[PDB]
Amino acid sequence: TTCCPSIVARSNFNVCRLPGTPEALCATYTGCIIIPGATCPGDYAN
């Protein structure tokens, strides 16, 4: 599951993913994170 710290970060994550870039690279690029669960915390609410 991916979780993002802000709106901007999610929007940039979704563009990063368009060419097929791995989630893990898009995470370090944007500040978003990958978690094994399904419930994002309050500081990664977007």
Swiss-Prot record:
One Pfam family this sequence matches: Thionin
Gene3D superfamilies in the cross-refs: Thionin-like
Main location: secreted
Annotated disulfide bonds: C3-C40, C4-C32, C16-C26
Protein's GO biological process: defense response
UniProt-listed InterPro entries: Thionin, Thionin-like_sf
Effect of P22S: In isoform SI
Claim: Protein transport is one of the keywords in the record: no
Annotated compartments: Secreted
Keywords: Disulfide bond, Plant defense, Secreted
SUPFAM superfamilies attached to this UniProt entry: Crambin-like
Annotated GO CC locations: extracellular region
Function in brief: The function of this hydrophobic plant seed protein is not known.
Note in the entry: Two isoforms exists, a major form PL (shown here) and a minor form SI.
Family membership noted in the UniProt record: Belongs to the plant thionin (TC 1.C.44) family.
Protein name: Crambin
Species of the source: Crambe hispanica subsp. abyssinica
